[PDB]
């Protein structure tokens, strides 16, 4: 399983869509002015994507590298830096289906 020898392009099963997904963005809330911090179930929420900070979690129960792969008991936040943050995806659950312009035009 060591070297990447082949790359594959296949269609996306809705089930797999939720598979790569971490939480679902449910509101058009980018970032509220008062606090540089993202709003709630917005686009920049940290649970759906991940920790806004470097190796510390949301409230501060676990703050270093000794417990790197452990999730906090009170709020789910496992972390390394702000880049393992930009590797997770979220999904939007569409009411009535729509189509891939790519497959139609």
């Amino acid at each position: 399983k060591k070297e990447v020898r082949k790359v594959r392009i296949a269609l996306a099963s809705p089930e797999k869509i939720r598979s790569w997904s971490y939480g679902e963005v449910e509101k058009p809330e980018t970032i509220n002015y008062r606090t540089l911090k993202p709003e709630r179930d917005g686009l920049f929420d940290e649970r759906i994507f991940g920790p806004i900070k470097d190796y510390e979690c949301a409230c501060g129960k676990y703050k270093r590298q000794r417990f790197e792969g452990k999730v906090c008991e009170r709020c789910g936040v496992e972390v390394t830096k702000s880049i393992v943050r930009r590797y997770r995806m979220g999904h939007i659950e569409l009411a009535t289906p729509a189509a891939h312009i790519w497959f139609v035009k």
Binding site: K2, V4, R8, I9, L11, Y87, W102
Partner: protein, 1106 residues
């Protein structure tokens, strides 16, 4: 020092006012120096009357155009970013169909730029030039058919561009073709439309051509007159009203499309002569009487039937013949846009004639300055034609002030069609230098004009020739039109003359671009001078006659990139124009009238003319040129001196003693060194740097602005949020940096302060500020620092605060600060110099006088040019200059050798002989003979065939010196260099190529925010691009990691570049790059959209990039 000049072809008339092209153009352009009374009504006035009698009944007429009070003065315009424009209004009076004519005596509608005494303009703070242009002179011509080798087609070209582009083709299998806008229609059809009936027509037209059968073709449409006018409308491609909408026909009558160029010469010239003969009106213009007159349409076909038939004259028109190409003087270009503005203005004034209440409308209601200003403004500042004045050195400016371009409006000529135009045509003789064009793409497309070449009444570059009736030559000259030159048989000026009479039976002359040996009785015209054949710029190379045309170009162009050296020296050997260039260009300041000197300050010279007047001439001290070069005027006159009219008061940027000088004359040995002069390397003697021989002063203009953010005005003060006082020293003046201060890379030139990380205070930086010192100025340090590279010495400063005296401060811009920084440019290893012949090269090694090639007598050389660069390239001229230059050293004298008429091989050996009595004559007396070294090289010289065996060393060496070679001892070994080596005074220059622009060395720095790239722009530099060409380069090598390294560790892998940096800091081995952020970013970019891009294992399975 004595100045001897060897010219034998009596130069009959002095060169003309070099900048005349530009100067006079604008004068005749805006006849603004003389009353509305004086005749000359072209340009401004003309374009005025063209569209001034406005007949909407509405009647607004023109009176007089007056203007003259310049808002501010020259320099002020420069110091303040102001465009040096004059104010222009004009008396107008609007009439009514009722009783009453109100005249609003003044409507200032625009501000037109002015022309310096040198010829340049000052648009926004900077000096620019309106370069001349060429095109097919709106007329009528006949060119061979495209593919069909059979018959030729007729063209009818009128500008401006909106006007039609007519062609007349004949395809016997069914039609006679007339095209306008790409659609063909029966040539006859229009003919009928005019009145020409089948009968009259064919009989006077079809005298000799059966072709006519092709015209009497209408036995159906040709029987209905005025109905054919309606029939021709149908012809228009779109569905419109049959009747009156004859507008499209109205358009080809007398107003807009055909041309309104001066009645009689503009188009009519290409009429009378080339085809038919008379022009009623201005163009095929007549909508009068309901019936139309086109004394043009029929003859164009009349010549078509002549051309295709007999020999009425051999009508085949050679496109490039300058007799069919015009040059657009600035005046014309500017006047052009002007009437475009006039039109745009008249456009809205007609609208406001209907919106009209009553008689109560005159100035305001009719006139709006909006169109005309944007118009003109647009030209001078937007047109691809007026540009940044190339002022590397005066000469430079002057050329750029006089060259011709093909590219432009686009209607004249484009880019991908040129192999034909790029050629120096037969006609360019004395009208377009054949050498001034630039190398690489764009060649032969953009070229400077000839010596005597002056633009006539309508653009065809005229050249001067001497009349000669019988075997007699006059002192009477005439500037012929390219076309008119072919009618005669002109002869060269090298032709021997005993005074006012020809000298040999078989004498050279050129009929029509064809070399022919003619007789004394047949010579009708003779060339004025060889000079006229080339350009000013070209006319500066000493022995051009011995230099390949190809390299000669490099040579001419090179001079334009010469740089002002503190110690300016004129060429030991000059062409004879150096004096003039400086003159006509305005570098140096001359004395108007005769008189005496009063004050000779280093800032101003005040003289007292003998006519009871006393003036003060201020000297531009040390101004910053457009290219960043020193421009000072050093007085060359002493207090109380009787000056001759037109005598140099002070020397210009590169003119000393009134002569043009760019670089210096150095003693040069022409031979090979270890390899320091390998390919095109040049070796230099430390000894040069010692006497500040090659030193240019340079200036860079850094600038910063105190912008007005909605977060808080940016203040310019001595206060810098980061607390350092040692870096605040130089910045003594609260905000500005002190004059005379030494600014290095990274120092603060000017201080400024703006608001924090956009909108909100940082909740993380509010806890850090509060811990150590809560009371920390919330303002940030945004200061104009010394950009990596260099700065030098601050020498002038400019600040523009609130109460603006008369400056145009952009919006949002609170106040502006300019800082001029200078430094001394001593010649160093990376610098590149070159001679007027084309030998260009960089300094390879700066040698200690100690061990460099010295002559018998202690005198060492200054530079060693590798001989090998002379054979391949063909430019003997330099080796010549060197020889003469050798006499000049020991004879202490400068010479002036004309282009093709200059010094000759015998005469030089003559002066060289003289030089031997100075070099070796003092040697005999001083008390010493020949060295055992000199004897030794003489042996190898005689066995070489340089000297005549059997003569005395004395005699020998002389004969050897005469060849232009002397002896030379190494310097390192003190041993001679077997074989005489030629040496001499060669004029060489330093170019606008300091290595200052040559070494961006990057370690680490800034990255783009949107795209991950090490772009520079701050204290940090950019990293060179790698391009695919260069990757392949690596690929072929099998340079895996070296390539991997380029793609990731050095660029995109943010995290990767990190590990690497750290690693290197630890003296460790850089980390292994796992996945380019480009790889992962792709996966996602592909997830973001349908496609599930999944990476796989050996056995088709998952793997995680993330």
């Amino acid at each position: 020092m004595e100045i001897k000049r060897f010219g034998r072809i009596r130069e009959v008339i002095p060169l003309p006012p070099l900048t005349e092209i530009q100067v006079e153009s604008y004068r005749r352009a805006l006849q603004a120096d003389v009353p509305p009374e004086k005749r000359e009504n072209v340009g401004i006035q003309a374009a005025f009357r063209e569209t001034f009698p406005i007949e909407e009944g509405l009647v607004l007429d023109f009176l007089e155009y007056r203007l003259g009070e310049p808002p501010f003065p020259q320099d002020e315009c420069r110091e303040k970013d102001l465009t040096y424009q004059a104010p222009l209004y004009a008396r107008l009076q609007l009439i009514h169909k009722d009783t009453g004519l109100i005249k609003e005596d003044e409507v200032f509608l625009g501000h037109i730029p002015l022309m310096t005494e040198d010829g340049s303009f000052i648009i926004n703070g900077a000096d620019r030039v309106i370069v001349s242009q060429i095109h097919r002179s709106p007329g009528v011509y006949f060119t061979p058919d495209p593919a069909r080798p059979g018959r030729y087609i007729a063209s009818i070209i009128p500008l401006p561009k909106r006007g039609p582009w007519i062609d007349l083709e004949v395809e016997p299998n069914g039609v006679v073709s007339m095209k306008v806008n790409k659609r063909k229609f029966p040539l006859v059809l229009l003919l009928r439309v005019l009145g020409y009936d089948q009968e009259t027509l064919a009989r006077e037209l079809g005298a000799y051509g059966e072709l006519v059968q092709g015209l009497m073709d209408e036995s159906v449409f040709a029987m209905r007159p005025e109905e054919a006018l309606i029939r021709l409308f149908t012809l228009l491609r779109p569905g419109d009203p049959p009747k009156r909408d004859k507008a499209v026909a109205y358009v080809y009558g007398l107003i807009a499309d055909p041309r309104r160029y001066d009645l009689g010469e503009a188009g009519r010239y290409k009429a009378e002569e080339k085809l038919g003969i008379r022009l009623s009106g201005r163009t095929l213009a007549r909508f009068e009487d309901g019936e139309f007159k086109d004394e043009v349409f029929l003859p164009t076909l009349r010549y078509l039937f002549a051309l295709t038939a007999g020999v009425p004259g051999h009508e085949v028109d050679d496109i490039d013949h300058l007799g069919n190409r015009r040059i657009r003087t600035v005046g014309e270009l500017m006047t052009d846009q002007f009437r475009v503005g006039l039109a745009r203005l008249a456009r809205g004034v007609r609208e406001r004639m209907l919106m009209g209440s009553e008689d109560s409308l005159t100035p305001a209601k009719l006139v709006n300055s909006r169109p005309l200003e944007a118009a003109i403004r647009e030209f001078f500042s937007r047109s691809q034609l007026s540009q940044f004045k190339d002022e590397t050195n005066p000469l430079s400016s002057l050329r750029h002030k006089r060259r011709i371009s093909a590219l432009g409006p686009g209607g004249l000529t484009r880019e991908r069609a040129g192999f034909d135009v790029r050629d120096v045509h037969r006609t360019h003789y004395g009208r377009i230098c054949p050498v001034e064009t630039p190398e690489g793409a764009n060649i032969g497309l953009i070229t400077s004009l000839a010596a005597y070449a002056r633009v006539d009444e309508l653009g065809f570059i005229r050249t001067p020739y001497r009349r000669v009736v019988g075997g007699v030559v006059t002192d009477e000259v005439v500037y012929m039109t390219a076309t008119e030159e072919d009618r005669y048989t002109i002869a060269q000026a090298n032709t021997p003359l005993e005074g006012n009479r020809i000298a040999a039976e078989r004498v050279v002359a050129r009929r029509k671009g064809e070399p022919v040996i003619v007789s004394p009785e047949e010579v009708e015209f003779m060339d004025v001078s060889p000079k006229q054949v080339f350009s000013v710029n070209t006319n500066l190379i000493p022995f051009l006659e011995h230099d390949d045309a190809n390299r000669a170009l490099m040579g001419s162009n090179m001079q334009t990139q010469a740089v002002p050296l503190i110690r300016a020296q004129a060429p030991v050997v000059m062409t004879g124009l150096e004096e003039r260039v400086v003159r006509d260009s305005l570098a140096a300041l001359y004395a108007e009238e005769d008189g005496e000197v009063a004050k000779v300050d280093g800032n101003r010279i005040v003289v007292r003319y003998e006519d009871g007047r006393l003036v003060e001439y201020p000297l531009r001290r040390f101004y910053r040129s457009n290219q960043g070069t020193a421009l000072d005027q050093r007085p060359r006159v002493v207090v109380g001196q009787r000056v001759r009219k037109g005598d140099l008061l002070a020397d210009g940027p590169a003119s000393e003693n009134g002569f043009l000088a760019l670089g210096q004359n150095v003693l040069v040995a022409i031979m090979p060194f270890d390899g320091y002069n390998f390919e095109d390397a040049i070796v230099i003697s430390e000894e040069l740097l010692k006497r500040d021989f090659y030193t240019s002063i340079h200036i860079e203009r850094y600038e910063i602005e105190a912008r007005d953010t909605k977060l808080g005005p940016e203040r310019i003060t001595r206060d810098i949020p980061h607390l350092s006082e040692a870096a605040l020293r130089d910045l003594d003046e609260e905000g500005v940096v002190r004059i005379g201060a030494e600014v290095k890379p990274g120092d603060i030139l000017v201080g400024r302060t703006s608001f924090k990380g956009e909108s909100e205070p940082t909740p993380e930086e509010r806890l850090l500020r509060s811990i150590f010192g809560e009371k920390a100025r919330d303002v940030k340090d945004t200061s104009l620092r010394v950009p990596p590279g260099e700065g030098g010495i601050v020498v002038r400063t400019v600040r523009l605060r609130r109460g603006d005296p008369g400056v145009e401060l952009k919006p949002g811009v609170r106040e502006v600060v300019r800082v001029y920084v200078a430094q001394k440019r001593k010649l160093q290893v990376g610098d590149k110099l070159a001679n007027r012949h084309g030998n260009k090269g960089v300094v390879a090694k700066i040698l200690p006088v100690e061990d460099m090639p010295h002559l018998p007598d202690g005198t060492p050389v200054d530079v060693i040019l590798n001989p090998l660069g002379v054979p391949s390239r063909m430019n003997l001229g330099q080796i010549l200059e060197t020889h003469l230059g050798l006499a000049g050293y020991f004879l202490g004298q400068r010479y002036i050798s004309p282009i093709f008429d200059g010094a000759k091989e015998p005469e030089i050996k003559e002066l060289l002989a003289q030089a031997f009595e100075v070099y070796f004559g003092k040697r005999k007396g001083e008390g010493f003979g020949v060295d055992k070294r000199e004897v030794e090289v003489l042996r190898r010289a005689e066995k070489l065939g340089l000297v005549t065996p059997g003569k005395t060393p004395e005699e020998q060496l002389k004969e050897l010196f005469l060849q232009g070679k002397v002896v030379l001892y190494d310097g390192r070994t003190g041993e001679p260099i077997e074989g005489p080596i030629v040496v001499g005074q060669m004029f060489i220059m330093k170019l606008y190529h300091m290595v200052e622009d040559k070494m961006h060395a990057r370690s680490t720095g800034p990255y783009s925010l949107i795209t991950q790239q090490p772009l520079g722009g701050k204290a940090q530099f950019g990293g060179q691009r790698f391009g695919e060409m260069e990757v392949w380069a690596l690929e072929a090598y099998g340079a895996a990691h070296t390539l991997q390294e380029m793609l990731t560790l050095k660029s995109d892998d943010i995290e990767g570049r990190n590990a690497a940096y750290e690693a290197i800091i630890k003296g460790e081995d850089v980390p292994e790059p796992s996945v380019p952020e480009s790889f992962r970013v792709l996966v996602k970019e592909l997830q973001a959209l349908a496609l599930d891009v999944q990476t796989l294992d050996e056995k088709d399975n998952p793997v995680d990039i993330f």
